[PDB]
């Protein structure tokens, strides 16, 4: 977030399949629709994967 809210805006890339926070960007990648529009089942599965 410090990279993104920055002048110039830093491009960033996330790798998948490893584990932990990168994968909860991956679930914030393929099921996202129009940017940050995230539904309730996916936010709750995300919450329990942070809790696990």
């Amino acid at each position: 977030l410090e990279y993104l809210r920055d002048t110039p805006p830093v491009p960033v890339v996330v790798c998948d399949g490893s584990g932990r926070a990168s994968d909860i960007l991956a679930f914030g990648h393929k099921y996202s629709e129009e940017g940050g529009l995230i539904n309730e089942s996916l936010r709750d599965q995300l919450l329990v994967t942070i809790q696990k």
Partner: peptide, 30 residues
């Protein structure tokens, strides 16, 4: 038939992804 292996086990893999989401939700539901 290795071509056929690759595509059919691809179907098995994505189907199991749906099954994982369903069973984790069911475990949350119990």
């Amino acid at each position: 038939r290795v071509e056929n292996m690759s595509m059919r086990l691809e179907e098995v893999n994505e189907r199991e992804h749906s099954m994982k989401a369903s069973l984790q939700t069911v475990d949350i539901r119990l």
